[PDB]
Structure 1
């Protein structure tokens, strides 16, 4: 019953958010066990933000230059290190609400939940997908740097994203929890452009299945096609190419509906070659590509 963009409950992540100040530079940090993870951009003064020398900026810092607080509680810093673009501050207190967790690096098209924070305080929760151009379309204001994205499986939080910066097109770029950027970006206040974005084809098909699995069925037709023929149409419309693994992943959704994957690909081809007739699918007048096949089954049980 119903189909919505749905985020994971954020309580386990809320318990891990702290404020990190270095000089006057302020951002959010992630407190797991006795380590606080935050973007290394915190060690940059306004005059270092455009072209920072992170090796030289950090060598001149000491433990007492980093102020970390979890609400009113102060955490004394007893060590600091740099791993790629992530600063690691060892503290004297282990977080008592540290959850079961793992650091993972997600693939384009995969989804996760974002907890937007400001000055170490959670502000809102929503779901994002990693775009094929390695950006995300979130909702972030000044002070959001260091907010994290995550998935939860069986009480284990998989941290996958740390927000770093906003790009000129308004999209957002960040790293994994090991400090490695998604995409070719760098941690510097320079104008950096994302590539042309493409549509996650497997996700659009999964969303089309969810519609039938709900009720919308006007887009279904009598045709079928081949993976090769569809991918020729997919390339023209800035859609990701479909692989046999994509076809295999959509198997469960294809089983419940009795609609062959290649039958749905033919339906999608027609929607692209003509239009959506100004009619709506699952309450939207556009083709939605930020629902994974897993997102669909877990909501359409």
Structure 2
């Protein structure tokens, strides 16, 4: 028992991480088979970051301009391309450590593990959700661009996120591995703001189920509510609407605990209307929304 924010083991991703340098600009790249993927703003100079014309910059570069370090081993670039906001740097040497992998784009409300790196060297691993407003609330300093987010299924690494940049509010923005940004953002050092965020209701309910599985029962009650009457309360507190498909996804957890989904919603309503009154749930005094139903089933089962 116990419930912690748990990342996937990061070994398979650590062996893919390289350093990429253009002149005095450096960041991380992802080395799979004979291609290194990295954020395209590695070709910007310090003063060309307010509105880079990435087509200029790339046509004026040559292969020998790209320094790729895989630890101590320098890697020879033998081809370069741009794909949306990432570069694909072809290299002569295929990565012997390439795991089986997929490029997937994730949905807001889904979680993934982040391997934060600096100068091609893994620094730490932690768990993130994609927020309804397409930002992530990560932990990233200068040098972290090119760090990737991922999920692991049996032996398959599904890469879903490459880090690019920090917004002024302190949250983070990036692309899928195909170079298309999550959310309405661009890779330029301009004023950009996220839309207003909401709370991921299905996740809060899943975390309430994790709590009940771990012995926290004080917020339970015997009232039930209807789906529409719960959504009226949700909208009032800036939670996203709950759908019938959310109720279905919660089925396994409703079955294991014997607490019907709409019964749990009555508890949630009460917590939103009343607060927690100095008690806690799974070591938190706020409602946590960064565990999916899958994440709960994964730990508690």
**Fold match by TM threshold 0.5:** yes
1:226-283 deviation line (CA, Å, top 9, x unaligned): 1111111101111011011101000000000111101111110110011111110011
TM-aligned CA deviation for residue 295 of structure 1? 0.5
1 CA distance for matches of 2:178 and 2:248?
Answer: 31
TM-aligned CA deviation for residue 59 of structure 1? 1.2
TM-aligned CA deviation for residue 114 of structure 1? 0.3
**Unmatched 5+ residue regions in structure 1?**
none
3-state SS of paired residue (1:47): helix
1:170-222 deviation line (CA, Å, top 9, x unaligned): 00000000000110000011121111111000000000011001111110112
Q: Does 1:152 align with 2:152?
A: yes
TM-aligned CA deviation for residue 102 of structure 1? 0.4
1:136-185 deviation line (CA, Å, top 9, x unaligned): 01111110011000001011100000000011110000000000011000
Structure 2 residue aligned with 1:48: 48
TM-score (norm 1): 0.99
1:36-71 deviation line (CA, Å, top 9, x unaligned): 000000010011111110111111111111110101
TM-aligned CA deviation for residue 109 of structure 1? 0.7
Aligned residues: 301
Structure 2 residue aligned with 1:135: 135
1 CA distance for matches of 2:244 and 2:41?
Answer: 41
3-state SS of paired residue (2:132): coil
TM-aligned CA deviation for residue 95 of structure 1? 0.4
Moved segments of 4+, more than 4 Å: none
2 CA distance for matches of 1:55 and 1:269?
Answer: 52
Structure 2 residue aligned with 1:266: 266
TM-score (norm 2): 0.99
Structure 1 residue aligned with 2:293: 293
3-state SS of paired residue (2:101): strand
Aligned residues: CA RMSD: 0.6
3-state SS of paired residue (1:69): strand
**Unmatched 5+ residue regions in structure 2?**
none
